[PDB]
Structure formats: structure tokens, C-alpha cells
Symmetry: C2
Subunit: 298 residues, 2 copies
């Protein structure tokens, strides 16, 4: 027993991390086969960032303007949305089986935080409903990636680009499309309103029951519609029958019906914990998906 | 910015994990050079565990009684305290630069949770003052290891053996010596009284200030002796001048004197948070060492 925020083993991704330098800027790149992927803002100076014409700035750059270090001669350079793709003369012999996926809000992934092409740590993040993540990133961490491992395949889903002034993080998929409304320009930007990921809080209450914390259970049940009236008041996402179906494996492992767990969540929202804790927390946790609970508890 | 519980990159350790089976029992082993290390209780049946004479049980075993799978012929077997060392016919070609260290209570490490010799996840643990850890381990996770990475060397410090009925975990160093009073016998055992790791809570308050949470700061200071009268009342470890010295780098990064931070901790202990949070927590966190904060924030 025990329930912890757990990252995927990072070995397969560690062998893909390289350092990319353009001008005075140094950040990380992801080396897969003979291509190094990194944030396109690596080509910008601070003055360029105020109003960058990335097409014109990329035209001015040549292959020799990119210094790529793995522990690599750049033979081509191109841009795909907000990512730069540097074709190199050597295929990464450590390239794992991989896919690029654009993940949905509410889903989790592991981040391999890197500096100067060297991995420093690994931790889990959820993609918030407002398309930000709450991670740990300093200057130089750009190009660090988020991923999931499914069977024997690394699914890359995130590349780091920036921190918003609210202290949350933003970036793109590996095709260079930002998650959320964000742009790679030095202009005022703000994330939209966030909400709590209801299906994840229910998954974490199931994790709590599996791991011996049951005090919040009650004899009551609710309808999906009545629960959603409370979710709205507390800025929790509406729960759908699809969310109920996704929680099915947890309902079977514990024998507790999803709508019965919804009545527990209703009481916690309205009354709080009265000084008690759930899995070592005094607040409700929403960064574990139902699959995260199933995989960890199985 | 941002502050997260971060594990070390696990690649170097992933290549060392193997599966060890003896009789009906399957657990994990650590393969370094031509030796596989695992918990000696792998040789016991459930009846043997009630009162095992490990010396006699090991004498009855032969090399062919151990099935070692990496993804290995056992040519020798011996016991060192509570670890079994299976000499194998093949040196691990993925053996990293490593050391075996016995860590001190209050220190942290990364755990690579494994099942059937396959890594499943990685997360940080602190060795509690009562020599237990609060992890996530199921049946089959025995032999999973804890480690730190220092420069380019893996320092192994923990091997998993058991869960106590309070839901906390216990194990040994890589020389087979248990942390704490625990024994590998099926007899009633209980951890001693735990306490909160004061120097770690102060490190996490410094992490909070570095990351923008400053509401708990006040104009007051305390003496080390006056602070320790409050620490005693709240079951916090006494703070020493050595702890004050260890916090020096954090005091320099923030410009906040250690005894000034001790006055903040005193107010939090006596009055609580009044519904506020620190780094996304409604409780005081003690599983980050001062070095964990320095390495993550630098």
C-alpha cells in the first residue's frame, strides 16, 4: 500500500536530451533519429522577442548558427509551428520507440527537467483545464519534455517554453502547437480561468479508500445532476457519464459505486475536512487520473 | 520558479533491475557487475517466515534453486546480513559508477518501484526519524532500491523488504542492515515514535519564499533555545547549530536569517495557516532536505 505521485522511469528519454545554443541563448533539445527538436524562440534575441517575425529571423539563420551538443553537426533547419527542427548528421543510437501525442486537459505526464542538455529530475504534472502546468522550471529549462510510457513506447506530449507571471508553466506539443492561448512573443499574456478536475479528485478518493483512508465515506448517494449543482458552486468541472465509465475499474476494485463517491465529495466540498487528512493531504488532490490510480494500485 | 517533489533521473538504475525467483516467491534484484543483490527472505516459505533460521535455510538451497531473469546463471550464493548475493556468470554491461551508502534519518532518496524486474515508477522518499519510509509498494516490490545521484555516481541506500501494519515501509541498506529495529521474521513489529524533521520544514519554508509564498514571514526572531521549547511541544526534532549551518546556502539565496525563519515556523505551529496554503499545501512539509531545495532552485 501507499499512494504517491510517481513519475515514469526516465531512462528512455534521458538518452534523447541534448544542448542547443544559438547566439547567447542555451536551451535543451530532443534528439530522435537525425532530428533535434527545440523551442523556436532559441533564434530570438530579447529585442526580437517583443515582435518576432519568425519566418524572417529563421531565413537569416544558417546551419552554423546552431551549436548542438550531446554529452552534432546541423545539416538542415526548419520550423514547424513553434518548434525548430534541426536535422543533424548523426541519428541518435539511443532513440527509443516513440510517438508524438497531443494530450487532453486533465491528463498527466512525467516531465524530465533538464539544463544544458543534462537531465536533473523527473516529476508528474497534469495538464490543467486552462492548459497550463504547475511544474518546476528555471531559466534554461526550455526544451525539457513531458511524456508517458505505454507498454514499450514513449509518447511525447509536451515541450517547455515559458513561465507565466502567475508562476505556472506553458509549452507546446512536439508538433509545436501551444497548449492554450499562449504565444512565443514577449507580450502580456494570461491563462484563462482554471477549474478543478472532478474525475481526478474522485480517482484520488478511490486511491484513498484502497490505501486505508475511508472516514469520508457515507451512506448517501446522489444523482449526477444534483452532484453537478455542487460542482458548479465550487468551480469543479461537470462530471459526465463518460467520467463515470472511466472510473469503472476503481469502482470494481473497491466495490464503491461512482455516485456514492460523488456524495462523499459533495460533503467534503461543503464542510471541509474538519482538521483531518486524506492520503497525507489537508486539501483535495486533482492531479491523478483514474488510470494513474489503477496503474499504481495494480 | 515552482517547487515540486522531484526524483533523480532513473536510467542508470533501470539497467540494473532483474527478477529473482525462488520457489513460489518472485521479487526484484539489483545486478551490479557479476552480483545480484536481493532480500534474503526470498528463500523462505510462509511457514519458514514465522521463525526462520536463515543460515540453515541457505545451506539447503543450491544455485539451481534461484531463477534470475534480466529482461542469468547463478554460480554462487551467499548472505550478508539480510541481503542475498547471487554471483552470476555474466557481468552487467549496464553497471553504472556506484557506491553503497547507509543514509541518515531525515535524508531523502529516489525509489525506483519495480515488479518482476521491470521498473514502474520513480518518486522521492525521506528516511523518517523512526527509520521507516512513506512510499508506494505492493506485493512483489521487494528488492526495489532507493538511491541518490551525486555528480556521475549512483549512491544506493535502500532496498525494500516490507510494509508495517501502520502502512509505512521498511528495508535495509545494500549491505543488508535494516534501517530501524525491524527484522525479516513474521513476528509482530512496530516502528518507534516518529517526529517532524525541523530542518526540512525550514528548508521548505525557504523554498516557499524563493517561489513567491511569503505571507508567513514576520518581523520577529527567536533564540535557538526558545524555538526548541516550541519544537518539543509540537513533536518537532530539536534544531541544532549544525542544522543552522546546513541551512546557510538558503539563508544566503533569500537574505533571511535562519532564526528569523524559526520565528515564522513558531507562529505556524501555534496558530496554523488560517485557511491559507504554502506551495500548494495546507500542512507543513518535512520531506525536502536543505540540499534538495538548493539543487532544485539552482
Amino acid at each position: 500500500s501507499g499512494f504517491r505521485k510517481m513519475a515514469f522511469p526516465s531512462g528512455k528519454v534521458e538518452g534523447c536530451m541534448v544542448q542547443v545554443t544559438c547566439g547567447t541563448t542555451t536551451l535543451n533539445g530532443l534528439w530522435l533519429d537525425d532530428v533535434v527538436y527545440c523551442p523556436r524562440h532559441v533564434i530570438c534575441t530579447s529585442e526580437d522577442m517583443l515582435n518576432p517575425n519568425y519566418e524572417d529571423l529563421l531565413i537569416r539563420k544558417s546551419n552554423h548558427n546552431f551549436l548542438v551538443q550531446a554529452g552534432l553537426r546541423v545539416i538542415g533547419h526548419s520550423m514547424q509551428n513553434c518548434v525548430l527542427k534541426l536535422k543533424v548528421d548523426t541519428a541518435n543510437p539511443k532513440t527509443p520507440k516513440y510517438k508524438f501525442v497531443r494530450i487532453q486537459p486533465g491528463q498527466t505526464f512525467s516531465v524530465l527537467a533538464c539544463y544544458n542538455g543534462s537531465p536533473s529530475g523527473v516529476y508528474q504534472c497534469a495538464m490543467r483545464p486552462n492548459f497550463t502546468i504547475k511544474g518546476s522550471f528555471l531559466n534554461g529549462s526550455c526544451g525539457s519534455v513531458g511524456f508517458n510510457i505505454d507498454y514499450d513506447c514513449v509518447s511525447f506530449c509536451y515541450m517547455h517554453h515559458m513561465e507565466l507571471p502567475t508562476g505556472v508553466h506553458a509549452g507546446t506539443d512536439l508538433e509545436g502547437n501551444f497548449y492554450g492561448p499562449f504565444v512565443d512573443r514577449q507580450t502580456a499574456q494570461a491563462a484563462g480561468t482554471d477549474t478543478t478536475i472532478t474525475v481526478n479528485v474522485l480517482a484520488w478518493l478511490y486511491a484513498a479508500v484502497i490505501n486505508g483512508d475511508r472516514w469520508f465515506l457515507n451512506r448517501f448517494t446522489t444523482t449526477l445532476n444534483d452532484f453537478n449543482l455542487v460542482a458548479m458552486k465550487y468551480n469543479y468541472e461537470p462530471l459526465t457519464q463518460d467520467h463515470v465509465d472511466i472510473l469503472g475499474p476503481l469502482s470494481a476494485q473497491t466495490g464503491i459505486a461512482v455516485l456514492d463517491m460523488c456524495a462523499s465529495l459533495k460533503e467534503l466540498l461543503q464542510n471541509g475536512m474538519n482538521g483531518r487528512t486524506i492520503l497525507g493531504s489537508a486539501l483535495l488532490e486533482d492531479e491523478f487520473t483514474p488510470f494513474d490510480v489503477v496503474r499504481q494500485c495494480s
